[PDB]
Amino acid sequence: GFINIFPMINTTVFVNDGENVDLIVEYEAFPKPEHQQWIYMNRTFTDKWEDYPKSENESNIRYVSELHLTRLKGTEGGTYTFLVSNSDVNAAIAFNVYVNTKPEILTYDRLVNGMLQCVAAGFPEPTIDWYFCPQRCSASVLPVDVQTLNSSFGKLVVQSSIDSSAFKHNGTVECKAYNDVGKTSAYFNFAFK
Amino acid sequence: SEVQLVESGGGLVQPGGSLRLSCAASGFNISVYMMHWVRQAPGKGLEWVASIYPYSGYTYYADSVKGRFTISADTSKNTAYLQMNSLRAEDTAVYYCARYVYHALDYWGQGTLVTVSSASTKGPSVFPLAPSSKSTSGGTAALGCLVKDYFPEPVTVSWNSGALTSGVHTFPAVLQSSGLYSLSSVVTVPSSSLGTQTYICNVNHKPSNTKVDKKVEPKS
Amino acid sequence: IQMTQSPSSLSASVGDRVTITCRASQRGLRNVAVAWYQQKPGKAPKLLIYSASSLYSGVPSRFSGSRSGTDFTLTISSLQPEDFATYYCQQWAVHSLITFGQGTKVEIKRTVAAPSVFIFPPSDSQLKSGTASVVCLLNNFYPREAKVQWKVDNALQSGNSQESVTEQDSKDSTYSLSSTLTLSKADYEKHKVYACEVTHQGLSSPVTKSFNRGEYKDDDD
Ligand SMILES: *[C@@H]1O[C@H](CO)[C@@H](O)[C@H](O)[C@H]1NC(C)=O
């Protein structure tokens, strides 16, 4: 016996916020599969999935399963594992689903030591560029510390820091976090702290 | 990045000739969504042409275009492709690239025009549809310009360089027995303004690089 | 193979209700799903409804879809100005995949308006080019149904003219038709009176607009 699984869409699903997406799998199997389901968070997927043979004949060994995800929030993301099995073989394929979300700047405040710190979270892993406004900001500033924190809502969190004594401002420092999706820019002004 | 589909590669070609359409996608990746090509013949409804899963490369075609058309996809460029070979006159349509989700097409590109004919690219002749007594109805006269014998679509007609837009009626093109397109662009205007105000057909035909500004004067 | 969308063309008004139906033909198909799209002139279609009844994000909740053992139905309650266009239905099935309906135009109804008929003789330049085109203009009329006949020297013409109807206006909500009669320069110069007879529901009697090539300070020769 055998079960060969061919994913019609990327097993690494980068889908944007609040949008629809189909996890489609076409697989050939013999003998006929008598067990097939979509598992999510160690439990059978709560909504519905279509499931049908490619051809309703007898010489048919091709099958298709479709899972309709709708309006993905940071909550309903993760691993969607499609399971198929017959009398001879158990088979599985996993769809790691990420709601692509531009980095949100969780915090942007001044530390007790004096350093400005910007902690931003998103997916994929956001990079933080520090800028300055001598208004539009173009003066690039070198970060003295950058690291990735271990998260607990369903993404990756990075924090970056700069030397705040260096500023003779009289001005504003821009924290710009970004990734493939979008970009967030927060601003810190020393005259109002 | 917002969601966008941009088609390109359309034009005018000979029967039996070939052409290659491309659909650039942004805001999302095509490796996750099924991509479809759907054409719309002029004056007619929608016809599904082809479809592909860019990730697997699995392809599906309409019965009328198989052996001739070949849909493909480059995920590294987030772009779809439609290689149209052995083109026929009935392939003349506006080709749309569309995103497929839940058995439906949720996003459409604004399409690209594809015309297949033996007729050569031709500039239009613009003739005055002069205002007159025969064109004046109770203090209101109607004038215009006949844009005749051009190929292919489209043409753009404005009045006084976009200034005059009220009461303007530009008729849709009609294919003649000669194989060329013709239409008239008319406008209703106070007849009192006839010996004082100037009115100009601003006609452009991009495929043939034809630009003509025709002053329409009441016949004498 | 195939799919029948009825009816072809409709008329309604703000606050009205429009029902429109699609029928798949027929059995043997698997997992049939039906979508409804909206399309405005010169633009790409927009997805209104998918999976028979599911509404897509963006379109107002006055768009409804349903299905029975016979019908796929799209209904709109309380129209709006932006609810006037052409509506298509598509179906997806395991076998055959994608099929489309023929699309139906929803329009507007109003009081009956008579056409303002105008006529334009050929220009000199065209006459030089070798051909003559006479243009009969039916302006701002209702309904779309209007009959135009051409008469050269009182002789009825057939097959040598083409009609073109504008898209329904989005202010006064009416139509404009143009009937272009095309003759050679030779045929045009051999005749005299060129008449356009227009018959329409808004007219008590057929309106005839003509011109004469003969038409000064001096009696003609
Ligand atoms: C699958 O998705 C990942 C993440 O977006 C991407 O890097 C990769 O190129 C995709 N694979 C293909 C074949 O497009």
XYZ file of C-alpha atoms in Angstrom, chain C residues 6-212:
207
model
C -32.312 34.405 -16.244
C -33.527 36.977 -16.913
C -31.450 38.943 -19.480
C -32.373 42.549 -18.607
C -34.354 44.240 -15.790
C -35.473 47.654 -14.516
C -35.834 48.899 -10.942
C -35.542 51.940 -8.673
C -34.022 52.997 -5.326
C -35.773 51.140 -2.494
C -36.958 48.387 -4.839
C -36.195 44.665 -4.708
C -34.454 42.700 -7.463
C -34.502 38.910 -7.761
C -32.251 37.078 -10.256
C -31.732 33.369 -10.908
C -29.123 30.858 -12.078
C -29.631 27.191 -12.979
C -27.008 24.447 -13.253
C -27.644 21.697 -15.798
C -27.725 19.314 -14.273
C -26.902 16.204 -12.243
C -23.795 14.031 -12.047
C -21.851 17.033 -10.785
C -20.059 16.976 -7.431
C -19.606 19.599 -4.721
C -21.258 22.409 -6.696
C -20.629 25.930 -5.398
C -22.025 29.142 -6.893
C -20.701 32.710 -6.785
C -22.206 36.060 -7.799
C -20.225 38.969 -9.258
C -21.022 42.596 -10.058
C -19.608 44.427 -13.083
C -19.803 48.078 -14.084
C -18.992 49.335 -17.629
C -15.256 49.535 -18.302
C -14.293 47.990 -14.962
C -13.314 44.524 -13.687
C -15.937 42.325 -11.990
C -16.191 42.379 -8.195
C -17.014 39.341 -6.069
C -20.333 39.808 -4.287
C -21.238 36.364 -2.981
C -19.438 33.023 -2.696
C -20.583 29.526 -1.691
C -24.230 30.232 -2.572
C -25.021 32.521 0.376
C -21.787 33.701 2.030
C -21.293 37.464 1.737
C -17.827 38.788 0.881
C -16.115 41.430 3.030
C -17.013 44.902 1.787
C -20.297 44.446 -0.082
C -23.347 45.755 1.858
C -25.655 43.268 3.598
C -28.475 44.130 1.195
C -26.912 41.520 -1.084
C -28.411 38.062 -0.526
C -27.794 34.621 -2.010
C -29.737 31.381 -1.693
C -30.286 28.011 -3.344
C -32.957 25.348 -3.755
C -33.249 21.984 -5.477
C -33.715 23.901 -8.721
C -32.534 27.493 -8.353
C -29.529 29.593 -7.427
C -30.865 33.016 -6.483
C -29.368 36.465 -5.886
C -31.682 39.092 -4.362
C -31.160 42.751 -3.487
C -33.419 44.598 -1.061
C -33.622 48.400 -1.061
C -31.551 49.456 -4.069
C -28.888 52.170 -4.103
C -27.413 54.175 -7.004
C -24.235 52.060 -6.837
C -26.341 48.898 -7.192
C -26.904 49.319 -10.929
C -24.670 47.226 -13.187
C -24.434 43.766 -14.748
C -24.533 40.681 -12.516
C -22.839 37.380 -13.337
C -23.113 33.948 -11.772
C -20.320 31.396 -11.794
C -20.309 27.781 -10.697
C -17.523 25.476 -9.598
C -17.735 21.690 -9.720
C -15.263 18.824 -9.228
C -16.019 17.908 -12.829
C -15.783 20.762 -15.377
C -14.547 23.206 -12.694
C -15.516 26.785 -13.633
C -18.595 27.835 -15.636
C -20.251 31.262 -16.027
C -23.761 32.645 -16.391
C -24.544 35.014 -19.256
C -24.844 38.056 -17.003
C -27.898 40.228 -16.486
C -28.178 43.989 -16.598
C -30.176 45.740 -13.912
C -31.315 49.148 -15.065
C -33.753 51.859 -14.083
C -37.379 52.493 -14.991
C -38.825 55.964 -15.385
C -41.392 58.062 -17.183
C -41.400 57.615 -20.945
C -39.153 60.184 -22.631
C -39.221 61.023 -26.341
C -35.933 61.318 -28.277
C -34.568 64.615 -29.536
C -33.801 63.738 -33.151
C -30.924 65.398 -34.995
C -29.301 64.728 -38.366
C -25.802 65.313 -39.729
C -24.889 65.274 -43.443
C -21.420 64.050 -44.499
C -18.527 66.508 -44.257
C -16.581 67.632 -47.338
C -13.411 65.832 -46.248
C -15.229 62.504 -45.994
C -16.779 63.073 -49.416
C -13.239 63.489 -50.743
C -12.049 60.332 -48.971
C -14.543 58.510 -51.200
C -17.412 57.778 -48.832
C -20.375 59.566 -47.183
C -21.683 58.910 -43.669
C -24.985 60.419 -42.544
C -25.592 60.399 -38.791
C -29.009 60.309 -37.126
C -28.919 61.140 -33.418
C -31.664 60.080 -31.006
C -30.976 62.006 -27.817
C -32.066 61.323 -24.237
C -34.934 58.891 -24.876
C -36.735 56.147 -22.958
C -36.964 53.241 -23.301
C -33.971 51.733 -25.111
C -36.355 50.369 -27.741
C -36.333 52.815 -30.643
C -36.733 52.078 -34.341
C -34.745 54.014 -36.939
C -35.417 53.812 -40.678
C -33.369 55.367 -43.468
C -34.849 56.866 -46.622
C -32.810 57.952 -49.624
C -35.088 59.878 -51.995
C -38.071 58.296 -50.200
C -36.602 54.869 -50.984
C -36.261 52.611 -47.942
C -32.721 51.511 -47.076
C -31.699 48.181 -45.548
C -28.405 46.655 -44.439
C -26.317 49.764 -45.069
C -26.567 51.336 -41.612
C -25.341 50.620 -38.084
C -26.816 51.557 -34.709
C -25.051 52.276 -31.422
C -26.727 52.796 -28.050
C -25.012 54.615 -25.183
C -24.832 53.220 -21.672
C -27.701 54.420 -19.470
C -26.953 57.841 -17.979
C -26.342 58.162 -14.237
C -28.111 61.487 -13.734
C -31.203 61.774 -15.920
C -31.076 58.000 -16.398
C -31.736 57.752 -20.146
C -30.247 56.696 -23.475
C -28.751 58.028 -26.683
C -28.728 56.182 -29.999
C -26.763 56.900 -33.163
C -27.707 55.454 -36.537
C -24.952 55.837 -39.116
C -25.873 55.341 -42.766
C -22.913 54.726 -45.068
C -22.905 55.221 -48.840
C -20.204 55.662 -51.456
C -19.458 59.161 -52.727
C -20.924 58.077 -56.064
C -24.161 56.759 -54.543
C -24.366 59.842 -52.319
C -23.940 62.328 -55.171
C -26.603 60.675 -57.337
C -29.370 61.235 -54.789
C -30.957 64.261 -53.125
C -33.087 63.964 -49.970
C -31.710 61.997 -47.015
C -34.278 61.199 -44.340
C -34.177 59.566 -40.919
C -37.548 58.309 -39.698
C -37.648 57.648 -35.964
C -40.447 55.688 -34.312
C -40.579 55.391 -30.529
C -43.159 54.780 -27.785
C -42.743 58.339 -26.521
C -43.784 59.706 -29.899
C -47.430 60.060 -30.916
C -46.332 59.885 -34.546
C -43.045 58.880 -36.242
C -40.552 61.760 -36.321
C -38.713 62.348 -39.598
C -35.554 64.461 -39.786
C -34.148 64.969 -43.276
C -31.799 67.140 -45.306
C -31.327 68.178 -48.929
